[PDB]
């Protein structure tokens, strides 16, 4: 997270840390008592890896009560996501068992009305990835509000010359951004997930290159499929 | 298949106003900026403007702010230019073309301002 | 404005040649820079865009280079439906801006 703050800890009980081999890779949204929304391109190069998902944290390091590591029964890409797009760019984790619900594990509600954030709407973002312009990230979680961009500007050739759909939608890039580490973690209008990061290989905090975030309700059929 | 259909030419006499209209079909019109170029007999381009479908706006050359007018029908997809209180060296051929993705244009309308 | 001044205004080369069209910003554009070909009573057909980038359907004869001032379009082996008028565009700053053009003649 590029020109945020650190986060009130487990003040987002929705926050998930997807790790590989017990390393931070992205972040998570938990959606469902035993399953985390994330983004597909984490998992694209994670190989053999051992994917986890880490509830109720702040720091990634410290002790905290809150604190449980989960293992990944079932990853489950939306079909249509490949490494060559940004389409479709959706992960969804099954927990080894339900999580145990409290103060600081929650699932969140998501958008399941696909109509468009209206521009200029203060976003919230959080994620454990790169905070500074050197490439290194944070121990414990930050966040930021970053205003939506309408798709029109976002696809100019400037910007991201086409590339935004129906399905995906951007905040204003600049000098507040996510980044790499972000993916798969949330974008929160009115305290309702609308967005999902997905950051992947582009340089944050440029705003010639807007955020990227998946749409939820665009998915919605795809989402409740899995989870029956 | 994506297509910039532009309107019929136009022959003006030196007072007047042209609306050249140019519908868009095979993606989602609202998605992307449209922008308007012209150019004169045997000479290059020259960029006017452009439009936002959502929002409405605009954003001008200063050369023509002045006399011409940028509107967008988003219930039947059509971006239109209107040039105003026409002149002779108005005479060129006016160019519509999407803003972002695959280089997509118009055929192009033919504006003649004569007395 | 940004001014784009291509080079040369005419240039008259064989079939099979290697090709340089050069453009210069009068001001840095980074790499927001296009190049189109139109050939007589036709509308412009796109043909790089991010300075070295080539659309979708254009050969790999046509390539792009430059960032910063100064662009270049190069024509590896210049095919018969190549000769046309070439004009370099800057998209990095408003107004847009476009070059005087460069028309491809055969030598002969």
């Known amino acids: 997270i590029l020109g945020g703050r650190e986060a009130e800890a487990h003040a987002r009980p929705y926050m998930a840390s997807v790790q590989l081999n017990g390393a931070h890779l992205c972040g998570g949204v938990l959606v469902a008592e035993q399953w985390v929304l994330s983004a597909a391109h984490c998992l694209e190069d994670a190989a053999d890896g051992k994917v986890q998902v880490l509830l109720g944290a702040h720091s990634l390091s410290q002790p905290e009560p809150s604190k449980r590591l989960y293992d990944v029964l079932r990853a489950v890409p939306h079909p249509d996501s490949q490494p060559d797009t940004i389409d479709h760019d959706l992960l969804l984790l099954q927990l080894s068992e339900k999580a145990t619900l409290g103060p600081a594990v929650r699932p969140l509600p998501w958008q399941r009305v696909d109509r468009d954030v209206a521009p200029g709407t203060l976003c919230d973002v959080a994620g454990w990835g790169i905070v500074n312009h050197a490439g290194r990230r944070p121990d414990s979680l930050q966040h930021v509000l970053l205003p939506v961009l309408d798709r029109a500007t976002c696809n100019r050739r400037t910007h991201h010359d086409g590339a935004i759909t129906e399905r995906l939608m951007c905040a204003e890039s600049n000098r507040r951004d996510s980044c790499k580490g972000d993916s798969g973690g949330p974008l929160v209008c009115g305290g309702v997930l609308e967005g999902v990061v997905t950051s992947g290989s582009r340089v944050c905090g440029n705003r010639k290159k807007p955020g990227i975030y998946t749409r939820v309700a665009s998915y919605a059929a795809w989402i409740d499929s899995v989870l029956a | 298949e994506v297509q910039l259909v532009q309107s019929g030419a136009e022959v003006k006499k030196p007072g007047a106003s042209v609306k050249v209209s140019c519908k868009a079909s095979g993606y989602t019109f609202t998605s992307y900026y449209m922008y308007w170029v012209r150019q004169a007999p045997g000479q290059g381009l020259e960029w006017i403007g452009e439009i936002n479908p959502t929002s409405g706006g605009t954003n001008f050359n200063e050369k023509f702010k002045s006399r011409a007018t940028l509107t967008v029908d988003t219930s039947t997809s059509t971006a239109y230019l209107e040039l105003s209180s026409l002149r002779s060296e108005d005479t060129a051929v006016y160019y519509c073309?999407?803003?972002?993705?695959?280089?997509?244009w118009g055929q192009g309308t033919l504006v003649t301002v004569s007395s | 404005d940004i001014q784009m001044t291509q080079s040369p205004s005419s240039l008259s080369a064989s079939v099979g040649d290697r090709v340089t069209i050069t453009c210069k910003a009068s001001?840095?554009?980074?790499?927001?820079v296009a190049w189109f070909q139109q050939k007589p009573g036709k509308a412009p057909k796109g043909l790089i865009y991010?300075?070295?980038s080539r659309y979708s359907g254009v050969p790999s004869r046509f390539s792009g280079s430059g960032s910063g001032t100064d662009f270049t379009l190069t024509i590896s082996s210049l095919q018969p439906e190549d000769f046309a008028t070439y004009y370099c565009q800057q998209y990095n700053n408003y107004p847009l801006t476009f070059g005087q053009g460069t028309k491809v003649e055969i030598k002969r």
């Open positions: 001001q840095n554009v980074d790499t927001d």
């Open positions: 991010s300075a070295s």
């Open positions: 073309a999407r803003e972002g993705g695959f280089a997509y």
